[PDB]
């Protein structure tokens, strides 16, 4: 019962407004503490440079017009509220692809009698990160993800990290990929004096055995046939079939390995480079 009267007292459209953000004493900044929590890295479509993650981002901020006297209301401490009605500092990716920006669920938020708000909606994010594919597959991937309020500059809000590292209490082993460290850092452009943002860096490592067994063994296996054709005697008349077949197989593997690598013309994969070299060698062999 008293919960309903509490909600009607707090959520009065005539008394409480949503479009204006709280501030006192000459437009003081409202500190917004956000920290990320990685659920499970679900996929890395390396061909499209898209990383799909499940994220729980927690956000805390102080708000003064929402307070109430806890003594009168049966000594209640915390109350649940909908997100669509109380104001909320927008925090969304920038390097996000797919058009999707905001969170998916719009959860309920916890409100204490002091006025602090602690809110965490879960979401799925599709970030865009460049693939430094040189040591395929024995490599590392450096994916960046940025948070920032697209609507407010550093004049009403100010983002502050809670902890230096992303939390992994609700993590599951991603299977193929294995994480190393999840650093986070607050950037600050002094030239703009308005630009703020939080950047989390994900350094990811690939467990190599799958690709190894699937591609490296057949590749070196068939390319061991390079210097093999010449020990064959010419009188039998069979060099042509073997050599042309080897060249064809190498072309096939080249096309495949070019299909799996993202078309990043910034650099050439090492495996592809070696395979092109041995292709030139085997055509010199055929001539």
């Amino acid at each position, epitope marked *: 019962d008293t919960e309903e009267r509490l909600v009607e007292h707090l959520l009065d459209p005539s008394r409480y407004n949503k479009l204006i953000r709280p501030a006192t004493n000459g437009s003081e900044l409202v500190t917004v503490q956000l920290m990320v929590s990685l659920a499970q890295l679900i996929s890395v479509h390396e061909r499209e440079q898209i990383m799909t993650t499940n994220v729980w981002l927690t956000q805390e901020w102080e708000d003064y017009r929402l307070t109430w006297k806890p003594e009168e209301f049966d000594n209640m401490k915390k109350v649940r509220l909908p997100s669509k009605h109380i104001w909320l500092p927008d925090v969304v990716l920038y390097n996000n692809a797919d058009g999707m920006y905001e969170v998916s669920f719009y959860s309920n938020a916890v409100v204490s009698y002091d006025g602090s708000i602690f809110w965490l909606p879960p979401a799925i994010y599709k970030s865009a990160c460049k693939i430094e594919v040189k040591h395929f597959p024995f490599d590392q991937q450096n994916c960046t993800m940025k948070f920032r309020s697209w609507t407010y500059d550093r004049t009403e809000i100010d983002l502050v990290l809670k902890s230096e590292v992303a939390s992994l*209490d609700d993590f599951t*082993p991603s299977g193929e990929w294995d994480i190393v460290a*999840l650093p986070g850092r607050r950037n600050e452009n002094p030239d703009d004096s308005t630009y703020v943002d939080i950047t989390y860096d994900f350094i990811i490592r690939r467990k190599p055995l799958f690709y190894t067994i699937n591609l490296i063994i057949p590749c070196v296996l068939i390319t061991s046939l390079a210097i093999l054709v010449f020990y064959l005697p010419s009188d039998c008349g069979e060099k042509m079939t073997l050599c042309i077949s080897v060249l064809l197989a190498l072309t096939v593997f080249l096309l495949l390995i070019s299909k799996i690598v993202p078309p990043t013309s910034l650099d050439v994969p090492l495996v592809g480079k070696y395979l092109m070299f041995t292709m030139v060698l085997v055509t010199f062999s055929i001539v």
Partner: antibody
Amino acid sequence: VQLQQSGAEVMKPGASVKISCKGTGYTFSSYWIEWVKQRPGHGLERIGEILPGSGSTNYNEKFRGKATFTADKSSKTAYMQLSSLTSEDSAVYYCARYLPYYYAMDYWGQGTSVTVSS
Amino acid sequence: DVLMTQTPLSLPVSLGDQASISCRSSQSIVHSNGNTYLEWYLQKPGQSPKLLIYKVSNRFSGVPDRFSGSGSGTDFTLKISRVEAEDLGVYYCFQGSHVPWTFGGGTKLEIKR
């Protein structure tokens, strides 16, 4: 932040010993924890590190099959199962926090002295 | 494993003197990003190791300025300006390029008279 370890331990050769590492004051399940082995004679060698979030482990090529780590997420504790023990491994063991490619190794443990003799 | 060699084994130097210690790697330990991740450690007798230099081109927050470190792509040198009574102990190297990580050999350092 603060680190805790187990007390002194003695055992007959050939058996197994499990030492504990307690951590508080930070996000325990967020970054690596590596241990350092120091023989009372000289040198510093590692034993391995684990990520208390996942089961991602690695070992130095000299101590393969000698130690097996284990981490717990609910209780902020890292364990290590020890293989067949010989009288050449009686030394002092450490624990420390670490994070690759960035700021790292700013705190330590207090030291765990393990001695093995008949 | 990238083995590490420290030189010398023991370098007795008196109070106020400048001392230089070299730390060489078996391979190149420069990461593809363009930054070499190496650590210097200080251990005192009967205590846990301390930190003085991380990311050699940088310095730790809490260590005085008398310490300095630099080096080329492979050869590394830790330098001290004025030796005090507190800097007694043994130094160590730690590389952060390849997996697994490794320490050095241990460089002994005491005073001389």
